[PDB]
Amino acid sequence: SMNPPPPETSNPNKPKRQTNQLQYLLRVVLKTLWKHQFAWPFQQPVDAVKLNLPDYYKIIKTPMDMGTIKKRLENNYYWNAQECIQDFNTMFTNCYIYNKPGDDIVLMAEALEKLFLQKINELPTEE
Numbered sequence: 001s002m003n004p005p006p007p008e009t010s011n012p013n014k015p016k017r018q019t020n021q022l023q024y025l026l027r028v029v030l031k032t033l034w035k036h037q038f039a040w041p042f043q044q045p046v047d048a049v050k051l052n053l054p055d056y057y058k059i060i061k062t063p064m065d066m067g068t069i070k071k072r073l074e075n076n077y078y079w080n081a082q083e084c085i086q087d088f089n090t091m092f093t094n095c096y097i098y099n100k101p102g103d104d105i106v107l108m109a110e111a112l113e114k115l116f117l118q119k120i121n122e123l124p125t126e127e
């Protein structure tokens with residue numbers, strides 16, 4: 001069995017910006033989620049081979065994870081905050097699609113999503 005290539009994290013042709021909202025997304029939002037007790041299933045692309053989840057990438061066609069988001073932020077990949085917020089939302093949605101109601105990992109994703117949304121409320125106004 002085989003994993004797909006990971007999502008791209010660098011593209012020399014893709015425009016980018018440094019903004020106060022993107023800085024907040026790295027320094028506060030990503031940092032807070034990354035340090036949470038429930039971060040570990042989300043800190044890297046799903047390794048479907050090692051985890052013996054051969055159906056994962058049959059079901060999930062837009063994979064996303066916090067490892068990839070962290071690299072996109074640090075590599076100066078993004079033009080805007082909405083791209084990064086979308087990546088977090090894809091990560092949560094994927095978890096709800098692949099797994100079932102009440103599953104361990106769904107409960108974890110729900111707790112991280114609640115925390116994410118709390119931090120997004122304090123997203124600074126753009127300068």
Ligand SMILES: CNc1nc(-c2nc3ccc(N4CCN(C)CC4)cc3n2Cc2ccccc2)cn2c(C)nnc12
Pocket residue numbers: 040041042046051094095098099104105
């Ligand atoms: C079952 N469904 C999913 N499992 C995982 C996933 N990521 C893991 C990372 C690493 C470990 N290992 C840690 C080191 N140990 C030695 C051995 C296990 C397991 C992991 N799993 C499986 C698991 C199962 C239940 C709750 C959380 C995660 C991620 N997922 C996402 C994202 N969406 N759905 C899933």
